Design a protein around this ligand. Structure first.
Ligand SMILES: [Ca+2]
Lengths: 595, 163, 68
């Protein structure tokens, strides 16, 4: 029956999920009448903005929304943090490699956004999330040993019971380290990465065949097709689906993502060298022919970015597309680079000499943004969220220590200029000898730092000398300071000790502690990065960004006439036939009980 | 018996002397087995090369921008590389008070094209004896570049090799 | 071309090369010389653990612990 469950959500104990739902109902057990969609909204907020809703109101046991009673008690027991009542709920589920990973992601997000109470949300929720990660790894490593070829079918299907999302996206969205260190997921990712070409080709052979095209045709590269039809047909027959033909192999080789990565990175280095020669050697009053290629290149690059915005996902909503598109970080770097280039192109044909210089400065800053967009590929990760968690804390702690040091150096500067100089009527020398010189002093070497005598470069006989001379210290006798030099040295020793050692050692302690924690964190960072590369270099068309508009013409003409690429992603996400689905789920339920 | 090769042979003997003097140290330090060396030499050299590539990108960026903003187009290619890849590369190892070497006109000569005896072209001047670009922006940009290059990457290099 | 026929060293080699913790311990007491057999098994396990490459749940833990 319906609504027996609605009352079951009504009777939930005081929790952070209950506080969120109570905040939602504005716009204790047994009083309310909670509708299911009001739950379903917050469940989407915890699960991710990508997925479809779980509960359509008054459409129960009838936009897929299948009615599974196994996944209701498990979700109800997970969202209130019950260690021993979700373990009872888990064996009643239908598919248990998607359920455990969805529970792990919900628990880690709900443990993150708690804030106030950290006796519960740290220990209980992170330990329960690691528990369900370990359960999912155990079930999948039991399934992978028995068949090893159905497991890869199991990781890529669509489960309708968890918002039409695949298991692999739930696995890698929540940063599950031990599920991706497993061998089967890496074999599946390498099988995607290598594309049409068969594995075990060494690294140099791919680039050497990318240089010389008929070398691939000479049998130098093993392919998928030939090896598969050679082993499969023969092994089955001897113990007891078309042959690749004349001109198909060229498009089959050019459709691979691994080759496309190299043919994009080489064009990007060519772009950097072209911009480097244009910015320095010839930047004429009029735009020279060499500088036109730059503009044609950008036009192709902007059209490429517009196509990524269009057909990375199939959400069909303009808020739905742009809201996930701006949630990237590499796209942010690209958006800022293109905006700076457009502002430079506006300023660059001003025909007034005042703005001609400013435009060149803008292009130099745009070059810095492009050269950092290089390093973003090989080092940084895609996700916007986890960066802020450490950037904010470490920048805040750095700023507080830096403020603490700035106070001390201002104190030393104001006193040191206070004691030995007559009142100075010029304000620039005040700041230049009170904040600048003690700031530059503390980085200097201790024998070099002693630069103290009465009269070398200071001139003070008639007011102040204008050509870059500070006022002299006051003299009592001829060629002597009234203030002893050894007090200046003693005071410099105290200031030098306290500034040089005690604060900077604390700065080096914090930054080094993060650096050692970051470097000693894991060995699975590179493996995680591979998957970040795979998507963008998978979807992108084969031909390099000089000739990407040639691909845009075909793909734009095809887009409005008859629907092209009906499976937008056909090696990641698949919709299994209904007769196969039941036999697939029964096998993994058997393996779960056997586990 | 031809003077062209007499020098090259002496260079070859010097390299052979270096190989003999390393054959000394092989006895007392290194081990015999060929196999276990590659297991760590390959990984550490590969990680070193990747970090070094990551630093080289940054120093090329800083050099091309810094020479981009304050100099008129230079028709000589050797000064381009000599003041765009060489000087920012030598800068990051220098001490921070010594690293500030910035003023308009000491050794640059630019009045008639370029001076041939080892003089770079001058920065552009608006007034007499002034850079149109402020010196404190150059210092501010040098501080940002110096911080990011001096600390964050090299500490990662020292972290791996020391580990 | 010596090739002596020893039945003790056949079950031990057959049980070592498939990584059986509890069936090579039965096979070891049937051997004739047991200071050469254990060291040969240790070398075979360490080389076979090195050149695996793909799977490192088995080849690290099981093989290096059995070799030690
Ligand atoms: Ca993009």
């Amino acid at each position: 029956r319906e609504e027996t469950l609605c009352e079951l959500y009504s009777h939930l104990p005081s929790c952070f999920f209950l506080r969120k739902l109570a905040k939602r109902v504005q716009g204790l057990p047994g009083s309310r009448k909670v509708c299911l969609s009001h739950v379903s909204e917050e469940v989407r907020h915890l699960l991710g903005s990508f997925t479809q809703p779980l509960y359509i109101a008054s459409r129960y046991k009838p936009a897929d929304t299948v009615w599974d009673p196994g996944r209701d008690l498990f979700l109800w027991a997970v969202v209130q943090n019950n260690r021993e009542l979700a373990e009872i709920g888990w064996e009643q589920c239908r598919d248990c490699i998607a359920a455990a990973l969805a529970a792990s992601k919900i628990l880690r997000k709900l443990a993150q956004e708690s804030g106030e109470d950290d006796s519960e949300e740290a220990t209980e929720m992170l330990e329960l999330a690691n528990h369900y990660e370990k359960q999912a790894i155990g079930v999948f490593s039991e399934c992978h040993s028995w068949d090893a070829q159905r497991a890869q079918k199991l990781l890529i299907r669509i489960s309708p019971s968890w918002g039409r999302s695949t298991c692999l996206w739930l696995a890698l969205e929540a940063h599950d380290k031990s599920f991706i260190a497993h061998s089967g997921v890496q074999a599946l990712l390498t099988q995607i990465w290598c594309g049409e070409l068969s594995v075990d080709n060494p690294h140099w052979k791919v680039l050497l065949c990318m240089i010389f095209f008929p070398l691939i045709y000479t049998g130098f590269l093993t392919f998928r097709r030939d090896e598969d039809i050679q082993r499969q047909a023969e092994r089955t027959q001897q113990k007891l689906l078309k042959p690749l033909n004349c001109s198909s192999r060229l498009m089959s080789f050019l459709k691979s993502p691994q080759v496309k990565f190299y043919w994009n990175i080489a064009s990007y280095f060519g772009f950097l060298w072209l911009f480097a020669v244009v910015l320095m050697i010839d930047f004429q009053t009029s735009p020279s022919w060499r500088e036109l290629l730059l503009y044609v290149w950008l036009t192709s690059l902007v059209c490429e970015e517009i196509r990524q915005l269009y057909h990375d996902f199939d959400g069909s909503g303009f808020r739905r597309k742009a809201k996930m598109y701006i949630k990237d970080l590499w796209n942010i770097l690209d958006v800022l680079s293109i905006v700076l280039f457009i502002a430079g192109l506006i300023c660059r044909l001003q025909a007034s000499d005042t703005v001609f210089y400013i435009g060149k400065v803008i292009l130099c800053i745009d070059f810095i943004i492009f050269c950092l967009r290089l390093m973003a590929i090989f080092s940084i990760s895609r996700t916007l969220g986890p960066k802020i968690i450490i950037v904010r804390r470490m920048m805040l702690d750095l700023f507080f220590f830096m403020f603490l040091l700035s106070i001390w150096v201002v104190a030393y500067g104001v006193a040191k200029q206070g004691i030995l100089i007559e009142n100075e009527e010029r304000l620039n020398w005040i700041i230049r000898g009170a904040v600048y010189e003690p700031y530059i002093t503390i980085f200097g070497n201790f024998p070099t730092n002693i630069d103290n005598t009465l009269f070398d470069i200071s001139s003070c006989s008639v007011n102040a000398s204008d050509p870059l001379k500070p006022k002299c210290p006051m003299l009592n006798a001829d060629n002597t300071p009234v203030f002893p030099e050894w007090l200046t040295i003693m005071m410099l020793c105290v200031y030098l000790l306290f500034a040089n050692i005690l604060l900077l050692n604390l700065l080096i302690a914090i930054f080094n502690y993060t650096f050692q924690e970051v470097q000693d964190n894991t060995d699975t960072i590179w493996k995680f990065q591979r998957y970040e590369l795979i998507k963008e270099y998978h979807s992108r068309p084969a031909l390099p960004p000089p000739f990407i508009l040639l691909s845009h013409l075909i793909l734009f003409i095809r887009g409005v006439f008859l629907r092209d690429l009906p499976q937008r992603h056909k090696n990641f996400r698949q919709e299994l036939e209904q007769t196969e689905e039941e036999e697939l789920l029964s096998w993994e339920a058997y393996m779960k009980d056997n586990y």
